[PDB]
């Protein structure tokens, strides 16, 4: 087509693509629906993720420098695991701003 190529990249790699994979992997270490997961657990399902959302291994380090938010003594909520890996990949260019504006406070 040419010339019109202002379409390239017409979406952000995080994509709804995204969501309903994860949750395909989701189901394999946690099929009772639960939404949470244990952190011994976590390197491993966080291995299980497919892009922009696979971190591999042995990048276990990388968890603990991005330590979510634990859940009752020994588990780790899904929600946060979800916004932190949404976070920690829009943190590149992007949103990332927004806690500049933070300085001047209000």
């Not at 949470?36 to 968890?63: G, M, R, T």
């Amino acid at each position: 087509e040419n010339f019109s190529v202002a379409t390239e990249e017409s979406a952000e790699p995080l994509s709804e693509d995204d969501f309903e994979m994860f949750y395909e992997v989701w189901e394999k270490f946690d099929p009772d629906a639960t939404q949470f997961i244990e952190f011994a657990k976590l390197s491993d399902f966080a291995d299980a993720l497919d892009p922009p959302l696979l971190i591999a291994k042995p990048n276990k380090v990388q968890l603990i420098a991005m330590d979510l938010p634990m859940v009752s003594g020994d588990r780790i909520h899904c929600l946060d695991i979800l916004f932190a890996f949404t976070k920690r990949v829009l943190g590149e260019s992007g949103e990332m701003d927004a806690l500049r504006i933070q300085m001047e406070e209000r």
